[PDB]
Curated annotation (Swiss-Prot):
Residues 2-180 form the Peptidase C3 domain. The chain holds residues 1549 to 1729 of 2188 of the full protein. The active site is at H41 (for protease 3c activity), E72 (for protease 3c activity), C148 (for protease 3c activity). It is found in: Host cytoplasm. Major viral protease that mediates proteolytic processing of the polyprotein. Cleaves host EIF5B, contributing to host translation shutoff. Also cleaves host PABPC1, contributing to host translation shutoff. Binds and inhibits host IFIH1/MDA5, thereby inhibiting the type-I IFN production and the establishment of the antiviral state. Cleaves host MAP3K7/TAK1, resulting in inhibition of TRAF6-triggered NF-kappa-B induction. Cleaves host TICAM1; this interaction allows the virus to disrupt host TLR3 signaling. Cleaves host IRF7, resulting in inhibition of type-I IFN production. Interacts with host IFIH1/MDA5; this interaction inhibits host IFIH1. This is Protease 3C. It catalyses: Selective cleavage of Gln-|-Gly bond in the poliovirus polyprotein. In other picornavirus reactions Glu may be substituted for Gln, and Ser or Thr for Gly.
């Protein structure tokens, strides 16, 4: 509907796949080469379904900060025959607050979904499902089951992936450029 939705659509149309694990279907952001991200609660194993195709997982790393606190991001390298467009130049270098973000989801349940979530706070610590978690972004939108893995964007920046909610607020794990240095 406007330039925020334009950037979000451009990311969804080229840099997402539908990932399926034993814990559900997730929006999955491809970052570069065969490297993608998903929430750690997806419990990625040795095999994952990508757009309903059986795909070997070459590597999976559940990230934690240097305090050994959960970040809720898992970086997955996929045994796929095709590379993602490299979007690492759209990743923030530092922790930050943002204005006027969009949360975008693409699954069997929620195809072509875009949500203007407004202001995003650097919330920091969250007890996420009983797990102490750091680097959490917060937005005041009542997000629902099915939106985990959704991409959080502003114009020109890919800032996080949706990992949970409390019925009134939604929470995303930050994406930082330093997670994807090769
Ligand atoms: C409570 C707002 N909300 C959140 N996720 C949705 C999906 C469909 C319709 C409404 C939705």
């Amino acid at each position: 509907m406007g330039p925020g939705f334009d950037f979000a659509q451009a990311i969804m149309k080229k840099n997402t796949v539908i990932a399926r694990t034993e814990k559900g279907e997730f929006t999955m952001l491809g970052v570069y080469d065969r490297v993608a991200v998903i929430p750690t609660h997806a419990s990625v194993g040795e095999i994952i379904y990508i757009n309903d195709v059986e795909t070997r997982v070459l590597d999976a790393c559940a990230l934690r900060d240097l305090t050994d606190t959960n970040l809720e991001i898992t970086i997955v390298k996929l045994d796929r025959n095709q590379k993602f467009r490299d979007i690492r130049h759209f990743l923030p270098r530092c922790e930050d607050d943002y204005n006027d973000a969009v949360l975008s989801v693409h699954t069997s349940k929620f195809p072509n979904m875009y949500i203007p979530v407004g202001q995003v706070t650097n919330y920091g610590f969250l007890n996420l499902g009983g797990t102490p978690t750091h680097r959490i972004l917060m937005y005041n939108f009542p997000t629902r089951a099915g939106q985990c893995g959704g991409v959080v964007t502003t114009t020109g920046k890919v800032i996080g992936i949706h990992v949970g909610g409390n019925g009134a607020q939604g929470f995303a794990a930050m994406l930082l450029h330093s997670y994807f240095t090769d």
